[model samples]
Target: GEWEIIEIGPFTQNLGKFAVDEENKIGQYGRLTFNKVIKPCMKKTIYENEREIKGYEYQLYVYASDKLFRADISEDYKTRGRKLLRFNGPV
Candidate 1:
């Protein structure tokens, strides 16, 4: 499962605040869709200081219920800016 959350406005403000009960579903085309209830809510911006200059970053978190799956994040998301990690496969 993959969800692409695009957030704007202050970096401190995010969907995590208003998304109390949001559901995500992916179709066969690899496109992501969500409940319509969140459509209007997503448009509104939540900012602490309206006049302050700010920026934001985006990232996606994909979940794999079964089988092998690995999600990659920005270098800052990892420790010591590690590019990748690996280990021996099971026999």
Candidate 2:
């Protein structure tokens, strides 16, 4: 499940804030003055590329129910300077 979230402003204020409510399937996606507030009111794991490169679990989180955003994570490992973007809900 995926949804498209169009930016209203410059879209350069890349800040990350997340609060997950698994029971309700919702999460906060933004917490910055420039970004304002965009709640990912639903979430889904679209893909999981497991342990092929140095025993890592890379996952893709697409928050898409009442809104949309993208989040990636490397489980059992750590990465640096990853380039990505996250935007969501009616902000």
Candidate 3:
């Protein structure tokens, strides 16, 4: 799928580590560990261009399947904005 860039923000630290880890049977410890490791990594940045028509932005797209999950971008790097795209399974 495709989406338009609406806003640009810094890279927030990767907080995935704090999510519940049900696969390992660690219970709430998995969640605590993830949060501790990822909260500080979140951050963002901005870019500028000389001409009014020369600015750009960034975005993040995620995917998941029965066996794995991943993330990727649809555009070239060094652009100036972003959109948050996400997916999930049925409840």
Candidate 4:
């Protein structure tokens, strides 16, 4: 696809002890790694509340050669580690 980017998910849930590609390896010698980041012009805000402490959306995105997105993961549990994600394949 020639599109700039495509995004999916706004999952407002705990993905820490959840499922994904790699394992959460904080104590295991791994880390919460964020490669690249980009804000999509086509995307907008969700149920944003001013008074509320939460005013954001959860999303997983990927792009073409010129587009790359990396994001941080906020844990559902108030633990002592991090939930990481990685996307690397050369450049």
What is the lDDT, from 0 to 100, of the residue 51 in candidate 4? Answer: 32
CA lDDT, every prediction?
A: 0.23, 0.30, 0.26, 0.30
Clashes of each: 0, 0, 17, 2
Write candidate 2's Cα lDDT for 15-89 as tens digits.
Answer: 223323221223434332222323322222222255332322222233344444444332232343222333333
Task: Count backbone overlaps in model 2.
Answer: 0
Output the number of the TM-score-best candidate: 2
lDDT of 1 by residue, 1-91 (tens): 1223444333212232221112121112222222221221112122225524222222222222222222222223212232222111121
Off by over 4 Å in 2: 1-53, 75-91
**What TM-score goes with each of the models?**
0.18, 0.23, 0.20, 0.21
Report residue 23 deviation for candidate 3 (angstroms).
18
What is the TM-score ranking, best to worst?
2, 4, 3, 1
Clashing pairs in 2: none
* Candidate 4 pairs with clashing backbones: 10-58, 36-70
lDDT of 3 by residue, 8-81 (tens): 32232222321223212323232122222211122233323544333222222211223222222122235433
* Collision pairs in model 1: none
Task: Please tell me which model should have the higher lDDT, number 1 or number 3.
Answer: 3
